[PDB]
Design an enzyme around this catalytic site. Structure first.
Site, PDB file in Angstrom:
ATOM      1  N   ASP A   1      73.351  14.713  -3.673  1.00  0.00           N
ATOM      2  CA  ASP A   1      72.206  14.637  -2.768  1.00  0.00           C
ATOM      3  C   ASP A   1      72.059  15.929  -1.965  1.00  0.00           C
ATOM      4  OD1 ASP A   1      70.285  13.887  -0.953  1.00  0.00           O
ATOM      5  OD2 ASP A   1      71.286  11.994  -0.402  1.00  0.00           O
ATOM      6  N   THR A   2      71.234  16.848  -2.461  1.00  0.00           N
ATOM      7  CA  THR A   2      71.128  18.124  -1.763  1.00  0.00           C
ATOM      8  C   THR A   2      70.414  17.998  -0.421  1.00  0.00           C
ATOM      9  OG1 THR A   2      69.113  18.670  -2.991  1.00  0.00           O
ATOM     10  CG2 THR A   2      71.242  19.434  -3.910  1.00  0.00           C
ATOM     11  N   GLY A   3      69.698  16.908  -0.204  1.00  0.00           N
ATOM     12  CA  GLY A   3      69.046  16.655   1.068  1.00  0.00           C
ATOM     13  C   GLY A   3      69.907  15.997   2.120  1.00  0.00           C
TER      14      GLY A   3
HETATM   15  C1  LIG Z   1      69.280   6.454  -0.763  1.00  0.00           C
HETATM   16  C2  LIG Z   1      69.662   7.913  -1.145  1.00  0.00           C
HETATM   17  C3  LIG Z   1      69.186   8.871  -0.075  1.00  0.00           C
HETATM   18  C4  LIG Z   1      69.684   8.486   1.309  1.00  0.00           C
HETATM   19  C5  LIG Z   1      67.624   8.937  -0.086  1.00  0.00           C
HETATM   20  N1  LIG Z   1      67.106   9.948   0.850  1.00  0.00           N
HETATM   21  C6  LIG Z   1      67.069  11.431   0.545  1.00  0.00           C
HETATM   22  C7  LIG Z   1      68.262  12.108   1.205  1.00  0.00           C
HETATM   23  O1  LIG Z   1      68.388  13.400   0.694  1.00  0.00           O
HETATM   24  C8  LIG Z   1      67.987  12.152   2.710  1.00  0.00           C
HETATM   25  C9  LIG Z   1      66.887  13.160   3.043  1.00  0.00           C
HETATM   26  C10 LIG Z   1      66.788  13.258   4.562  1.00  0.00           C
HETATM   27  C11 LIG Z   1      66.177  12.156   5.408  1.00  0.00           C
HETATM   28  C12 LIG Z   1      66.109  12.307   6.902  1.00  0.00           C
HETATM   29  C13 LIG Z   1      66.604  13.547   7.545  1.00  0.00           C
HETATM   30  C14 LIG Z   1      67.172  14.642   6.701  1.00  0.00           C
HETATM   31  C15 LIG Z   1      67.272  14.495   5.221  1.00  0.00           C
HETATM   32  N2  LIG Z   1      69.189  12.643   3.336  1.00  0.00           N
HETATM   33  C16 LIG Z   1      70.008  11.855   4.281  1.00  0.00           C
HETATM   34  O2  LIG Z   1      69.734  10.732   4.523  1.00  0.00           O
HETATM   35  O3  LIG Z   1      71.142  12.556   4.796  1.00  0.00           O
HETATM   36  C17 LIG Z   1      71.865  11.997   5.884  1.00  0.00           C
HETATM   37  C18 LIG Z   1      73.415  12.247   5.440  1.00  0.00           C
HETATM   38  O4  LIG Z   1      73.498  13.587   5.695  1.00  0.00           O
HETATM   39  C19 LIG Z   1      72.676  13.943   6.955  1.00  0.00           C
HETATM   40  O5  LIG Z   1      72.029  14.988   6.765  1.00  0.00           O
HETATM   41  C20 LIG Z   1      70.491  14.528   6.690  1.00  0.00           C
HETATM   42  C21 LIG Z   1      70.381  13.300   7.132  1.00  0.00           C
HETATM   43  C22 LIG Z   1      71.724  12.687   7.005  1.00  0.00           C
HETATM   44  S1  LIG Z   1      65.765   9.397   1.745  1.00  0.00           S
HETATM   45  O6  LIG Z   1      65.228  10.479   2.529  1.00  0.00           O
HETATM   46  O7  LIG Z   1      66.194   8.245   2.530  1.00  0.00           O
HETATM   47  C23 LIG Z   1      64.515   8.913   0.522  1.00  0.00           C
HETATM   48  C24 LIG Z   1      63.561   9.953  -0.025  1.00  0.00           C
HETATM   49  C25 LIG Z   1      62.533   9.479  -1.055  1.00  0.00           C
HETATM   50  C26 LIG Z   1      62.500   8.026  -1.490  1.00  0.00           C
HETATM   51  C27 LIG Z   1      63.483   7.051  -0.968  1.00  0.00           C
HETATM   52  C28 LIG Z   1      64.524   7.466   0.073  1.00  0.00           C
HETATM   53  C29 LIG Z   1      63.221   5.690  -1.632  1.00  0.00           C
HETATM   54  C30 LIG Z   1      62.298   6.015  -2.796  1.00  0.00           C
HETATM   55  C31 LIG Z   1      61.623   7.325  -2.460  1.00  0.00           C
HETATM   56  O8  LIG Z   1      61.562   8.140  -3.545  1.00  0.00           O
END
Ligand SMILES: CC[C@H](C)CN(C[C@@H](O)[C@H](Cc1ccccc1)NC(=O)O[C@H]1CO[C@H]2OCC[C@H]21)S(=O)(=O)c1ccc2c(c1)CC[C@@H]2O
Lengths: 99, 99
Positions: free
Chosen positions: B25-27
């Protein structure tokens, strides 16, 4: 290009005639962008992650340029704290993970 | 390996001697795993995602192997919807984005 992950992988995108900053996010199935008033039809959706769900508007066949690479696909618009480019568009610009 | 993004980038990890599936998860800045038993001390922490904030147990300096690549670093344990491998460990295994 090659992007290391010491820092958040933020890039400039062009969508709806506006430039924004967004994360190249391999953990997002689809792309999610901050509230913006795009024209056209949309359908409501709920997307979940850490902390719970948010309500978003699903727009289809939206053109986006990502670091000069053009793509077109689904964009979800709502109160996300960050703009994330998801796999639906990352595949279109030829993005891979490598180690 | 080179990993394309037409599917979720799911891989097998080894942590605390148990195998699990996790998302590259690069995000994600941080690594967050679903509820599990992990030996050693831990401190309460809060992390925020797309839907708000959750309480996690923070384990520091934990050995974790990701697709055959060893890392040692912080692992947050709590009610995440899916096991995510974030940048704190992706950098350790030498993962980059390329397009
Ligand atoms: C479940 C798998 C992951 C959690 C799904 N996420 C994507 C992850 O990269 C999120 C991105 C992000 C969100 C807010 C702030 C910064 C970055 N990162 C994340 O939560 O990181 C946590 C742990 O590390 C910390 O640093 C950053 C925040 C903390 S999501 O954004 O929730 C998502 C996107 C599209 C879609 C969905 C769900 C459902 C379908 C649609 O396609």
């Amino acid at each position: 290009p090659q992007i290391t992950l010491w820092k958040r992988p933020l890039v400039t995108i062009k969508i709806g005639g506006q430039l924004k900053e967004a994360l190249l996010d391999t953990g997002a199935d689809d792309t999610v962008l901050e509230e913006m008033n795009l024209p056209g039809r949309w359908k409501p959706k709920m997307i979940g992650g850490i902390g719970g769900f948010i309500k978003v508007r699903q727009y289809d066949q939206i053109l986006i340029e990502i670091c000069g690479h053009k793509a077109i696909g689904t964009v979800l618009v709502g109160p996300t704290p960050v703009n994330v480019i998801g796999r639906n568009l990352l595949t279109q610009i030829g993005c891979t993970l490598n180690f």
